[PDB]
Write a protein that binds this ligand. Structure first.
Ligand SMILES: [Ca+2]
Ligand SMILES: [Ca+2]
Ligand SMILES: [Ca+2]
Ligand SMILES: [Ca+2]
Ligand SMILES: [Ca+2]
Ligand SMILES: [Cl-]
Ligand SMILES: [Cl-]
Ligand SMILES: [Cl-]
Ligand SMILES: [Cl-]
Ligand SMILES: [Cl-]
Lengths: 340, 340, 340, 340, 340
């Protein structure tokens, strides 16, 4: 993700104009190759019409170009493109909101799993590691970046997210389906074990912890659902066909015809169709943005920073439940305190 | 469902162009027959106009074609089609999100229903089987795929989802309505029975399990509501009438008229209306996608994989609450552990 | 409601074309009278122009028809109609989702209100009857079908939904406002009374039951809000004025003018304006669908089946909490059971 | 609010046509003055053009009118108006849904705050009065109708919503901010006091009551947020400028030009621009509806009936928790009862 | 924020026309510089065409202006602008709703943390200060106004939001990530410490307080997500390019051409393009409003009043949990009381 929120805090003269100079995460970088191909095809066809074709062939080409320019409006580019982009964008934000955070879980684990000894620290750290492991498992199922970071479970073990004993237990459980849900069952059973050993005071606090665990599970299930249930392939095919056919038609219909023939709309020959290239910029770019957002867990510049989030969650959880377990600053009177 | 999320992780040159070559779940496969019918009708009418009709009849046909092409724009195809498709798509995703998953229930059942003996295993397995049975019952009510898998309750018994004793009890209960809610009542009563026998420690954990059961029930009720309350038939009729009438008009108005008559827009005779066929592709295909998504629980290529989900849920639940009941990996110090 | 979900499970050739032959819940049945009136008015005006008017009067009529056809596009029919229909449709589905179901309540009442004796059965049945009575009261407030079924409270008593003692207590409570909330207070007080008599084990289960009761209340309040707060009358008036004025203009502007005058667009006289009648079908039908959906609790073919839902809820609740209280099938090993 | 839901239950011939005859809450009543001003300005300009201007001045006016009519389409009236109206309407319904109701609170207070003596009645009545007082305070902050009913806190005291002792305590608390949140703190502290005196059985029921109180608070906070955070003034200014400039242009561009000059579109002189007046009706009326809905807590005919809701809530709450505390109808066998 | 809700309570003649006279938070103030630049460029080009260019150069300029005016409609300004503005507006309101309020927390802390002595007051005040500190930390991360108020943590200490001991503990915790979550862990641990010392009666009330704390955390996480995940830069670049290119084209295509050349649409020379300047007002202003709303936590006139909210929350929380802890008005009979 290329964040620029702080740069656009205030509406000033040209507060978006500076953002046009940026290359990382820009429309130029996404549209470079398609734009170059389209421009080269247009100018090759222009050179063929201007230098190669004879008089009769130029007349035939002019008729074909008038035909294409008139009937290319039958292609409902904006109709399909707007629907497709709205669907992509809603799914994009919903997918961000489904990424699990350990903060709600760690607040309860840090304060309700008692014991400053080695066993209490082990329990709190293991619970946090199980929750983070569920998140890691589903993320590497749904994200190519995370999967390239952890191409096998041995990589997960070498990163300290899973112990070798947990890896052996994980592999001993036989299931022909995705095993991201295993650490949630491990978490619930460990929490109940902590409760039965006196480390969790009572079943209200245990149930609060289990509720947060199930909330985390539901987040992972939403990630799984957006990965599994992609946008229907028919929509993707239709929208790319619409854009591509419209600009293939424009490759002929937007040529600069001979001004001596006095065709309507072809009175001035400027050689470069600035407005056609602009229209390509807008529509093709709209499609390319949809192409980048359709899976926001890849390695695009604007895709979600999933590996960074994994690192942050691990470090913050382990610090919250180990370093900051019953570790409070000294209670003192604040500035606004008033004596009785 | 034809998932392709991993293939479009990164926005590259033509990241959607490869998807155009796929046949399963494609627009081509959905639109094949309608496209063939439309093309055949257009070319039959073209041959009648070109070879059969005389001069006066050709003149009458030309007038009719100008009339049809001018006044076919009174048909608000995109107006009705966009609304209908937006409604279909919102209902499609909402229906996916209403499919019940047993994970939240199984996390609590695996850890809070005590006993490593035969009776504890029987209790946990039976509770999970009841929840899965409710999901199966509503799914076979709402899904033709699941119904064809389980055409009667005897098929449900033979698949191990229901015991013969449970089938006899199920049939003994007399109700002129859908009986998918029975296993939820069975689940709540069994959970209370487990609590009264000491298998559930206290009523906070019992209430947590019952809350998850009621959440599952609400999912099943949402499935029932989307099945029962279909999109109003009036909308379906209006939208199909709009598409069909528009392209029936196009069968006449988009013919290649005689260029010698110098009709405006009929200067070039290309025999094949490429842009009319494209417009059919887009609009008719938009309707066909709506036809495929209107009931996403059928046997379309892009419909939900309900039988697979049933299998996954059953296997995962039974493993979670039986194999993984109080079965934790050895607690050990993680990689990031620091000594005091 | 006319459900057809099972008929459109799979996308086939013409999967919507069969639905065009249905009359119940169809656009034809809703639009019959308006279509007949519009067609009769058009043909009466056509006969006046063709047979009654003289030359000067025909010329004046032709000028008026050109004027009306040109300036009827100033009426933004689709602009207002799309907004009005989107509002109607969102409110329609939200109103369906607000209809209360007793299943969540009955799951807890069946399992947590103890006693197989007469008093336990009386308690469970009375609690379910109170919840169903709240739903019935709000439904007969908001639904003309339910109100015609129960035109007074005596009809509610004769249907077994309310006892005569409960009717006397209900009438003794003096309130100048809608009394649908009374049975919820009765339910909460009876549940607390059951708890105080030992029939509910503890206050966690009591609070769970009260939470479900309050969830039910909120559903009834949403029904009350959609009934009370109708779509602003200004919108309804504006949208009907727009449709009616547009087609009143079309009654003149869409007449077949004399082809000898060579008016642009009036070259061919077909006597029947097929595309004008189609445009009436689509726009007027869109309005009629809004007219049918604006109150989905009436007696339209596509309105909600509220009386059937009342019957289903009553029968299912009473069976759940009486016949199926602590009445479980024999626990037995399932098909997938494995011995230790 | 002008409710008409019962009148449109069934879709019949002209089910909206009757609503056109209503004056209260109608578009005619909202648009009367603007329509009269627009019509008078149009006819004054028409009289100036027809009777006062000379030949050269008429020619200049005709050129200006052609210019204005052609270039007034550059004003994107529907673009801005549709967005503004959608925002207004979403905020309108969200504001209705944020109005607090005491029913959920009163169900718990009536059944869980024990004691049939004077002190129990005082406790229940005072708790309900505190919750209603919070709602009243926020409503008079956000509603001009409620504020005109209660212009000072003395009016609130004289209406029995607040006792004089509570008014003295309320004024003794010093805060430079809105004090609508005070009675919620009072409610929570009184509920805990009732619990500590044995009037609330245990802390699960106390916590349920506090949860409902916090739900009520959140409703009041949503009301506060919609009042504080109005629709951005820039949007309101832009949309009114767009409507006003478009119809100021129409005051010139829609005049009936001299038919002898044979201007295109000015062939027939009807003196009254029926379609221009219709277009004013639709667009200006759309803006006026937005003007009425932007603050639905005023004194418009279609604004929310806030004073009536206040009265209803007070009476119903006091009856629920005082008259109907442990006051149940006699338990008896229902009509469907079956003996063992 | 410039609130004007009270001024538009009632729909009257010109209820929006007064708002046009306001300068603070107005479209004029946002669009002043861009409008001046556009107007100056247009009139400079007009003077060049009218006074500097010769006959041939004027003819070339006229051809270029016809070309630009015809082909500037290929730029889909409204298509991209409407999508971008809808996304901005949805994110704007969602960001307001994510701002944390301490009221739900303070209601529970004021009533459930016992003790009128110094230690009870210290506990309640410290808990409220921790929750407010979390909100302050995330706000200064996401808001330039709050960050300019508190440029370092020393400023937070000097404002009484954090004690120097808490600052030393805060800095001793080592984390390469944003530390806004620290005070939530501190809050949970302090609440558990209060519970273990007898200040919180039992674990149901403790869990209620922790649930409200986690709700607050989730609000802070939503703020963090909207700050981190900005609107994709590609969209911002595309939309600003579309607006800027369209009006750069209008700088040539909307010039007043020589009326003697009888170009269609250039019959009247008024020197000032009133409708072009209006179209700039609407479209450019629409973009500027998006520029102001894209980060509503800045220092714009219409941005959220975050510093004021911080002040209000601090003062109200400290008063709620200290001055109003077990401090209730005298219980007395209300006006509507009836004796038995
Ligand atoms: Ca991507
Ligand atoms: Ca299907
Ligand atoms: Ca109806
Ligand atoms: Ca108002
Ligand atoms: Ca800003
Ligand atoms: Cl789940
Ligand atoms: Cl339900
Ligand atoms: Cl309610
Ligand atoms: Cl709040
Ligand atoms: Cl969070």
């Amino acid at each position: 993700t290329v964040t620029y929120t702080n740069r656009v805090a205030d509406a000033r003269l040209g507060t978006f104009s500076q953002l046009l100079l940026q290359w990382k995460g820009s429309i130029y970088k996404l549209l470079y190759s398609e734009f170059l191909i389209f421009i080269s095809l247009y100018f090759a066809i222009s050179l063929v019409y201007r230098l190669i074709l004879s008089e009769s062939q130029r007349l035939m080409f002019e008729k074909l170009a008038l035909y294409c320019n008139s009937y290319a409006e039958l292609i409902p580019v904006s109709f399909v493109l707007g629907f497709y982009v709205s669907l992509v964008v809603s799914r994009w934000w919903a997918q961000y909101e489904s990424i699990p955070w350990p903060d709600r879980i760690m607040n309860l684990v840090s304060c309700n799993v008692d014991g400053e000894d080695e066993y209490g620290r082990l329990l709190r750290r293991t619970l946090m590691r199980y929750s983070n492991l569920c998140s890691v498992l589903i993320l590497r199922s749904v994200s190519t970046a995370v999967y390239k970071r952890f191409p096998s479970m041995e990589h997960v073990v070498r990163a300290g997210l899973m112990t070798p004993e947990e890896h052996k237990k994980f592999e001993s459980l036989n299931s022909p389906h995705n095993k991201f849900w295993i650490p949630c069952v491990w978490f619930s059973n460990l929490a109940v074990k902590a409760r039965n050993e006196g480390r969790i005071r009572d079943s209200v606090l245990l149930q609060g912890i289990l509720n947060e665990l199930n909330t985390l599970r539901s987040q992972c299930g939403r990630l799984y659902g957006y990965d599994w249930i992609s946008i229907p392939l028919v929509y993707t095919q239709v929208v790319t066909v619409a854009v591509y056919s419209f600009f293939l038609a424009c490759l002929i219909g937007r040529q600069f015809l001979d001004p001596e023939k006095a065709y309507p709309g072809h009175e001035l020959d400027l050689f470069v169709p600035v407005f056609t290239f602009l229209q390509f910029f807008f529509y093709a770019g709209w499609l390319k943005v949809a192409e980048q957002l359709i899976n926001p867990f890849g390695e695009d510049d604007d895709d979600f920073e999933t590996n960074w989030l994994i690192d942050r969650n691990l470090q913050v959880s382990l610090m919250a439940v180990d370093e900051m377990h019953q570790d409070l600053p000294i209670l003192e009177k604040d500035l606004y305190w008033n004596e009785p």
